Each structure stands twice: as C-alpha cells, then as structure tokens.
Design a protein around this ligand. Structure first.
Ligand SMILES: [Mg+2]
Ligand SMILES: [Mg+2]
Ligand SMILES: [Mg+2]
Ligand SMILES: [Mg+2]
Ligand SMILES: [Mg+2]
Ligand SMILES: [Mg+2]
Ligand SMILES: [Mg+2]
Ligand SMILES: [Mg+2]
Ligand SMILES: [Mg+2]
Ligand SMILES: [Mg+2]
Ligand SMILES: [Mg+2]
Ligand SMILES: [Mg+2]
Ligand SMILES: [Mg+2]
Ligand SMILES: [Mg+2]
Ligand SMILES: [Mg+2]
Ligand SMILES: [Mg+2]
Ligand SMILES: [Mg+2]
Ligand SMILES: [Mg+2]
Ligand SMILES: [Mg+2]
Ligand SMILES: [Mg+2]
Ligand SMILES: [Mg+2]
Ligand SMILES: [Mg+2]
Ligand SMILES: [Mg+2]
Ligand SMILES: [Mg+2]
Ligand SMILES: [Mg+2]
Ligand SMILES: [Mg+2]
Ligand SMILES: [Mg+2]
Ligand SMILES: [Mg+2]
Ligand SMILES: [Mg+2]
Ligand SMILES: [Mg+2]
Ligand SMILES: [Mg+2]
Ligand SMILES: [Mg+2]
Ligand SMILES: [Mg+2]
Ligand SMILES: [Mg+2]
Ligand SMILES: [Mg+2]
Ligand SMILES: [Mg+2]
Ligand SMILES: [Mg+2]
Ligand SMILES: [Mg+2]
Ligand SMILES: [Mg+2]
Ligand SMILES: [Mg+2]
Ligand SMILES: [Mg+2]
Ligand SMILES: [Mg+2]
Ligand SMILES: [Mg+2]
Ligand SMILES: [Mg+2]
Lengths: 114, 100, 275, 68, 88, 53
RNA sequence: GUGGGAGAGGGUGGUGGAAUUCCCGGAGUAGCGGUGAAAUGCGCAGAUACCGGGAGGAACGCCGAUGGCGAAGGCAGCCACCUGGUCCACCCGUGACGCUGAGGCGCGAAAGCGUGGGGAGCAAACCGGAUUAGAUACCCGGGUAGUCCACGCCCUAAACGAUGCGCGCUAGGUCUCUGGGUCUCCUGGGGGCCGAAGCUAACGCGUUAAGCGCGCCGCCUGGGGAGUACGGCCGCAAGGC
C-alpha cells in the first residue's frame, strides 16, 4: 500500500478528471465530473470538479493515501474548485505544480482553435 | 583556414579506457581533416538541463581550432559517427561582445 | 536518367531505356562468368510450373559475392562498374589487394578507385560490410544476411535498401524494403548503402517486343479462356467474374492471406507491411 | 529587477556559462522579455541567439513545470 | 568568398597605371571575377534565384562599362575582352 | 485618419488593461490593425509595472 | 578602391526540444468525448485520466514587436558551408561611364497539374449527428485528394500603400531600427506617428507627397453585355494572355 503519493488533475472546458497515483506514477484511484451523478455540460462546472476531486481523495484515503503532490494539467472552469477542495479534503497536499502541455508550435490545431 | 570551436558531449558512464579511446579517435579525426588545435577547455562531466540520451549526466569536451572552411561539415559527421558521441556542435569563432 | 526517344515509330514514342552512366567497363570478367541454364519455367519433370516464361536473350551468369565475410580485413579497390543482365542492380568489380577479384551488387555512390573492406573493424562507408551489431542504428544498409553466415538475402534489388531501427538482445531490428519490421541476427553481415540504379523503376518498356526480350511470354486472362481452363472461363459474350475472382487453381486471388499460419519464422516478425 | 544591472560586466557571445545565462530566463525557462532583461535592442538578439545554442548544448532548460 | 589577396592580385594586373583602383578595365575585371564565381555558384545551386538577380545586375553593369570603354577607346576595349576571355 | 480613434481606443483599452496587478495578456479584438495596439498597449503598461515598482 | 555593420535575404547539408497521433508494457475502472443544449462516435473485447519505452511527420513556443531583410511574391529553432543585396566611414581611383525602358528574359503567394517519394496533425469532396419549414450550410464525430520533399509545369490574386521608376527644391515636433562622430547632442540610411507652406471633390496627403518641377514608361475615356465571343499565342489539363 501507499500513503505518500500524488494526484493528477485533468482540467478541460467540458470536464475535470482526477487521478490519484502512487509516487511511481501508476494510479490508485481516479474520478471525474462524470463519475458522480453528472452528464454533459454539468461535468464542465466548478461544483462538479469539487465532488470529483473529493471522491478522488475520499477513495485515496480508503487505501491509506495521506500525502500527495498535486500536478495540474489543463485550463478548466472546474480547475479552481478542484485544487481547492483537495487541500480541504483532509490531504497532506505536500506541493502544487502546473504541468500543462504546450507545443513549441507543433501540429496545426483544429478549425475551432484557429 | 578559419577558427571554429567544436563542442563534444560524450558518455558519462564510460571507462577511463573507453573515454581515452574516443578522446583519441576524436583527436585523430581532427588531424585528418586539416584541423589544427589552438586550445582545449575540457570540463569533464558537468550535469544537464535535460536527459541527453536518456542520461541526466553528460561528458563535455571542447576545442578551439583552425581548419580549412571547406572541410568542417564532414568533420562533424565523422564526429557523430561514434556510438558514444552524443552532441557535436561546431561554431565559428566570434570575438566577444559585452554589456555593462 | 531514363533516356527517352522521339516518336519516329509508334513504340518509340513511350519506350525509355536506362542511361548506363555509372557503367565503366563493358565485357564481363571471363573468370567470373558461367553459363545460366535457361529453364523456360519447366522443372525437371519437363512440365511448365511457371507460366508465360521463355525465349529471352541469352545470358551469362556473373558470379556474385553474397558472403563477403569470406574475406575479412583485406581491403579492395573498385576496378569497374558493369551491367549484370541477371539482376536489376549494377555490379561492382572488386580488385582485392590479395590479387583475387570478385563482384558485388553496386551500391549507390560507389565510384571506381574507391576502397572498400569488410568486417567489424571496418569504417562505416558505402560499400563496406560489417555484421549488423557493429552498424550504427539509423544507418541504411543493403544485401543483408538473414541468418548468420548463410549469404545475403534481403534488399538486393535496384534502389532497394533496409534500415536499422534499434537493437534488442542478440538481434537488431530492421525495416525491410517492404516496410516489414523484422528482428534479424546481429551476427549477420549487411553492407552499408542503398542498392544503386534507383532509376530502374522509371523504365517504360514501350512495346510487346521488349517484354519478349526479357523472357516474358504473353499472359492470357482467365476471362479469355474456357471453363476447362479457368474459373473465369466462358459465358456467352464477355462476362464479369461471376464469383469471387480466382487463380487458375481455384484459390481466391484478392486479399486471401497466404503465408503459412504456424511458421517458426514469426516471433521474429514484429510488424507486417505496409500500406 | 533589471538583470543587466543586478549582474556585472559580461560577454553574451560565450554560450557556456550557465551561471551568467540562467538568470535570463523566467522560472519556466522562457526567455525573458526586454522589459525584464533591461537589455537593449541589439543586445537581446545576441542574447537569445546564444541562449538557444546552449539550450541545445544542454546547459539551459527548454522548459520547466510551474511550482506553487 | 573572394579574399583580399585574390582581388589585389587581379587589381594590380589590370590597373592602367601603378596606383589604379577604379578605371573601367579594373572595374570590369572585378565584376568579371565576381560574375564567374556566381555563375559556378549557380551551375551548382540552380534553385537560388535571388542571387541570380544580382548576377544580372552585375552582368548589366559590366555591359555599360564595356560599351562606354568601346566608344571612347576601341583597341583598349578589344584588348580587354580577349584578355578576359569575354563576349561570346 | 478618423480611424485613428479606433486605434486610440484599443491601445488605451490595453494600456489600462495592462496596468492592473493582475491583467489578462490574453484579451484583444479579433481584427488585426486594432489588435496591434491593444497587445502592444498591454505591453507598455506591463512594462511600466516593472519600471518604477 | 580601402576599411567596418546590421538583418526571418537566397541555396545545400546536418541537427534540438516541446507537443499531437499510433504501437508495446505497467497501473487502474465506469465512463470518455462533445455542444447553447445534445447526438452520432469511443468504452467492461478495459477506453478517458497517469506512468515508462518506441515509431513517425509536420510546425518551430519564450526571444517577438507597429521590430528586421528582400524588387515583388515573400522570409523565423540552432549549426556550418556556398551566395545576393544594402548601409557607414576615408575622399584614394575612374571621368558623365547617366536616367527610363516598347518587345525580350528571369522571378512570381495559394490553389491546381505530371512523375516518384511521404503522410502525424489538419482538411475541399464524401459519410454520419444535430439545428431547421427544409439545411445539399453555420456546430459535432468521422474522412480522401491536398497540405510536406525532389524534379517539371501552371503564371493567377484585395500580387494593395488599391500610390511606376530616377533626380532636384520646399517648417518642424516626436520614437524606433541601424551605422559614424569632438557622444547631452551632432550627423548618414531605413521604419512609423502629428503636422508649415502647398495639394485635394471631399476624405485625406504632406522630406517615405497625393507639394513644386523635369525625363521616361505603363494604363483611363459612361454602366451592363464581359474579361464574354471570334481569331491568335501559350498550357498535359485546369485555364492564361
Ligand atoms: Mg474533455
Ligand atoms: Mg550509353
Ligand atoms: Mg579455363
Ligand atoms: Mg533432368
Ligand atoms: Mg523424364
Ligand atoms: Mg511508372
Ligand atoms: Mg507481366
Ligand atoms: Mg492478357
Ligand atoms: Mg472464348
Ligand atoms: Mg472451371
Ligand atoms: Mg485441357
Ligand atoms: Mg472438369
Ligand atoms: Mg464466369
Ligand atoms: Mg452480354
Ligand atoms: Mg467470354
Ligand atoms: Mg492456397
Ligand atoms: Mg546573413
Ligand atoms: Mg533541413
Ligand atoms: Mg517525442
Ligand atoms: Mg496500455
Ligand atoms: Mg505514453
Ligand atoms: Mg504581404
Ligand atoms: Mg552576406
Ligand atoms: Mg581627387
Ligand atoms: Mg506559382
Ligand atoms: Mg502549392
Ligand atoms: Mg502533387
Ligand atoms: Mg451532413
Ligand atoms: Mg468537421
Ligand atoms: Mg477531424
Ligand atoms: Mg483533381
Ligand atoms: Mg494592404
Ligand atoms: Mg515597398
Ligand atoms: Mg490592378
Ligand atoms: Mg515601370
Ligand atoms: Mg505619375
Ligand atoms: Mg556610436
Ligand atoms: Mg530618415
Ligand atoms: Mg526596406
Ligand atoms: Mg499624418
Ligand atoms: Mg489625387
Ligand atoms: Mg479598356
Ligand atoms: Mg481570369
Ligand atoms: Mg479562342
């Protein structure tokens, strides 16, 4: 089992997903706006990102996970109430990072993003 | 005949034997293209920003040389040719420019 | 370069021949030829076992060295480049310093008077042969052995070449000319460079005659036959296949995978070709 | 914090001092604007021209993840 | 590129009097040299058009000079293109 | 030329949007000639937070 | 001529990282994706999310900007090699060698075409889902040419500053690039801004003229028909002139 660890926050315009991992990076439990009650545009919200982030913690704790680093990838409207509720979920929250991938001008994006 | 300065990055994990042999092959090759060495700054290991060759550690040489303009590019090929050789960057010598 | 023609006759209009540029010397090494018995696709039974075959121009077989590790460490000079009627490629005449002369399939870029050699100690340059294990990953190479000391099989044809994608254990991983990804024993000799005459493919034969010179007799469609003869035979006045298209032997000829299921040779085949 | 002041007389042609150079990037590794560098026009060119060379050498990072 | 010695080499050869720098014959031979180098540059890289532009400007200039030289002094004109292997 | 005053607006829009603590850096107009101003306007004001402070 | 500069100017070879997709392995589980909202789509045959490894193509973030370079089209990771243009300073040389330019020749964005490569992302056509009275669209999930390289064609454009080129003469103010100097300034060449005089139908222009003059070229002569038809020339075609 594991106690020290880390948690990945996937923050997008349509949803927010979190995965709690072990320090080696292989996940332990995951959750997302979908996972609790919510379909469609509702998952895209801050309030939803909250329960997801919590259900992620509350299921981390059932394994004994205590200490976790938050690594953040996305730009969500659920991004804020996610990191927030993690600190407030009863987790050691030992650090906070933002890893969001960005290209150095890579492949041309879809018409939507032009 | 112009002044360039080669920068070679080699394998961190090499033998004294291995390292010496590459350092030989290098010194060798330079002679063959008509490179005359005007200096060496060799810094040994000196670790990195990112993992060249999946390896945080890296081994740096460097040489300020004088060789015929025409022959330089081939040299850099002949340098990279080695399994251990990792970067090779040659740069023409340009008199320093300072700020405040 | 593909020499073209003015159309002073109907066939001459589209016909094209090679440039024979890289060719230096025009009669073969007398010691190195040997006659090629022409079969006409008949086997020892007398029977045609391969159709539409025969009547080509007479040829002498030029003996080629597909081993090369035969002579390790002894350098050789390139004496000439010659036309070989038995293969798409061109052959290089080597004068070894030993005094012994051999032929090899000429890689692209060989010039006469170049020095080539074979073995582990060998510089990595066009025309030299090393076991694969000493060949830098990402280099393109040809005339590759498949199993060690068994002779070069892969990548001999004009323009072909195969590339080294990485090593794994006692094997290196090659991408064959087809696009197949095959594990191949490290101990196997390959020779650096691509096969020459990459222009071969651009040749337009141009008339029926030319095919006949190359020993290729007219091919007849199953459609143009009768039911005794062929699956597609018969039907009154010019018909569509009328069942899944098949070979004269009755096996399906579009898509039906034919390589043997259980072949021990897999487990070395990483990925099939291609696109 | 204009970094050309906070530092001293130095040559930015030489690409090898990761010391002198690394002050010139934001935490993330992004080359710093002219506002922050306190560099002139002509200078800023000779700067990043050499910075990149070093990033290629492996001495400077291309990027870093943002910490809170 | 052409190096100062190479230039001077030619320059001193075509100079009318010992100290000559300008002087149509010299100017010509200067262009001529940079031309023929460019030609060979082009024979190799055929895909370089911008540089080609220059060649035409150079060739153009050489022409003007040559003409002017011709309508002042023939002879000294006919002396140069033969000495320079020019005007085919 | 009477469209000066679109530039003038949009530069100013940016020059004030720049001086914030914090500003956006991401928030222009979708026309071109107007966006030069707002982003290069957000420039001075983001540079003037450096100078002085 | 001598001596110096700046720059994404062009051509060839090489090389670096970020990211997308696909593939192998691990770890893990009930949804993921997507919109205004949805659906198609993907997912217990184990996806999305996360970790490690590999393949591959394309484009080069921060620097970076109203900035720079080019005659125009246009040009951007970094390295070298080959190469054009252009600026400064010295007042050394030549002695009007000049400007322009019908035809000609070369270049000429994208799309398109031929041959052979290449194909990750994107994406005409195309197939679905929606919205709709319908929706041959806008939005969504797919997807082929094409987009990339070589070579050869094509020769068009809001190819625009809708301003042909060269020289001279006519307030300044301002900030910016890059040279030079007895360095606050002074001064040469680019780039913008407000503006004397003057111009203009007005808008506006204005030492980067649309001012005031000279040289030369190109074009205009009501709208539609029409950049059509006929002829000619060019192109593989499209189609151009
Ligand atoms: Mg999403
Ligand atoms: Mg011949
Ligand atoms: Mg005999
Ligand atoms: Mg028999
Ligand atoms: Mg018998
Ligand atoms: Mg063909
Ligand atoms: Mg056949
Ligand atoms: Mg037939
Ligand atoms: Mg019949
Ligand atoms: Mg039958
Ligand atoms: Mg029969
Ligand atoms: Mg029967
Ligand atoms: Mg039938
Ligand atoms: Mg019928
Ligand atoms: Mg029939
Ligand atoms: Mg069968
Ligand atoms: Mg340059
Ligand atoms: Mg390249
Ligand atoms: Mg990668
Ligand atoms: Mg997997
Ligand atoms: Mg991965
Ligand atoms: Mg433009
Ligand atoms: Mg230059
Ligand atoms: Mg004088
Ligand atoms: Mg074109
Ligand atoms: Mg195109
Ligand atoms: Mg094509
Ligand atoms: Mg539809
Ligand atoms: Mg679509
Ligand atoms: Mg798509
Ligand atoms: Mg078509
Ligand atoms: Mg315009
Ligand atoms: Mg202009
Ligand atoms: Mg017009
Ligand atoms: Mg004109
Ligand atoms: Mg006029
Ligand atoms: Mg100065
Ligand atoms: Mg000026
Ligand atoms: Mg300009
Ligand atoms: Mg004005
Ligand atoms: Mg007017
Ligand atoms: Mg008219
Ligand atoms: Mg038209
Ligand atoms: Mg007609």
């Amino acid at each position: 089992q594991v106690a020290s660890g880390r948690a990945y926050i996937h923050a997008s315009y349509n949803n927010t997903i979190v995965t709690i991992t072990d320090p080696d990076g292989n996940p332990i439990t995951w959750s997302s706006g979908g996972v609790i009650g919510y379909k469609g545009s509702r998952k895209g919200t801050p309030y939803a990102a909250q329960l997801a982030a919590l259900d992620a913690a509350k299921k981390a704790m059932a394994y004994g996970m205590q200490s976790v680093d938050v690594i953040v990838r996305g730009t969500g409207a659920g991004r804020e109430q996610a990191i927030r509720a993690l600190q407030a979920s009863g987790l050691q929250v030992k650090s906070i990072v933002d890893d969001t991938p960005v290209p150095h001008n890579g492949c041309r994006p879809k018409k939507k993003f032009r | 005949m112009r002044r360039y300065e080669v920068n070679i990055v080699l394998n961190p994990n090499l033998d004294q034997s291995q390292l010496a042999l590459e350092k030989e092959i290098i010194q060798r090759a330079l002679e063959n293209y008509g490179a005359r060495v005007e200096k060496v700054e060799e810094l040994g290991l000196r670790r990195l920003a990112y993992p060249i060759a999946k390896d945080p550690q890296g081994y740096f040489l460097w040489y300020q040389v004088e060789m015929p303009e025409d022959r330089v590019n081939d040299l850099a090929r002949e340098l990279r040719i080695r399994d251990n050789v990792r970067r090779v960057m040659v740069v023409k010598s340009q008199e320093p420019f300072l700020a405040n | 370069a593909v020499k073209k023609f003015k159309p002073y006759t109907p066939s001459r209009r589209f016909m094209t021949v090679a440039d024979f540029s890289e060719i230096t010397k025009t009669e073969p090494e007398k010691s190195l030829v040997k006659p090629l018995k022409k079969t006409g696709g008949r086997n020892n039974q007398g029977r045609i076992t391969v159709r539409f075959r025969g009547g080509g121009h007479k040829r002498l077989y030029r003996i080629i060295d597909f081993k090369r590790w035969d002579k390790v460490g002894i350098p050789a000079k390139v004496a000439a480049i010659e036309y070989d009627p038995n293969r798409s490629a061109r052959i290089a005449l080597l004068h070894y310093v030993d005094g012994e002369k051999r032929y090899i399939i000429a890689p692209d870029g060989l010039q006469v008077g170049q020095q080539v050699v074979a073995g582990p100690d060998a510089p990595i340059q066009v025309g030299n042969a090393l076991p694969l294990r000493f060949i830098p990953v990402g280099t393109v190479v040809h005339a590759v052995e498949l199993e060690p000391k068994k002779g070069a099989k892969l990548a001999r044809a004009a323009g072909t070449s195969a590339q080294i994608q990485g090593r794994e254990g006692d094997y290196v991983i090659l991408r064959l000319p087809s696009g197949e990804l095959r594990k191949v024993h490290g101990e196997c000799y390959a020779t650096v460079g691509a096969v020459g005459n990459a222009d071969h493919k651009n040749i337009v034969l141009g008339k029926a005659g030319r095919s006949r010179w190359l020993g290729r007799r007219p091919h007849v469609r199953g459609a143009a036959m009768n039911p005794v003869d062929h699956p597609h035979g018969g039907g009154e006045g010019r018909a569509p296949r009328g069942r899944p298209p098949a070979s004269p032997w009755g096996w399906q000829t579009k898509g039906l995978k034919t390589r043997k299921r259980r072949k021990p040779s897999s487990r070395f085949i990483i990925a099939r070709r291609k696109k | 914090a204009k970094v050309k002041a906070t530092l001293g007389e130095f040559d930015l042609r030489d690409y090898r001092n990761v010391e002198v150079l690394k002050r010139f990037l934001s935490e993330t590794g992004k080359i710093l604007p002219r506002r922050r560098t306190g560099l002139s026009a002509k200078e800023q060119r000779i700067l990043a021209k050499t910075i990149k060379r070093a990033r290629i050498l492996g001495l400077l990072p291309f990027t870093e993840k943002l910490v809170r | 590129p052409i190096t100062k010695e190479e230039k001077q080499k030619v320059i001193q050869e075509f100079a009318r009097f010992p100290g000559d720098t300008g002087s149509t014959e010299v100017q010509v031979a200067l262009l001529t040299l940079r031309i023929n180098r460019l030609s060979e540059h082009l024979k190799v890289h055929k895909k370089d058009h911008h540089s080609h532009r220059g060649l035409l400007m150079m060739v153009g200039q050489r022409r003007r000079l040559l003409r002017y030289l011709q309508r002042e002094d023939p002879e000294r004109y006919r002396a140069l293109i033969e000495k320079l292997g020019i005007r085919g | 030329r009477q469209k000066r005053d679109r530039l003038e607006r949009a530069h100013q829009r940016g020059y004030q949007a720049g001086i914030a603590g914090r500003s956006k850096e991401m928030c222009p107009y979708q026309t071109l000639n107007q966006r030069s101003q707002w982003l290069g306007g957000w420039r001075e004001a983001m540079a003037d937070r450096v100078v002085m402070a």
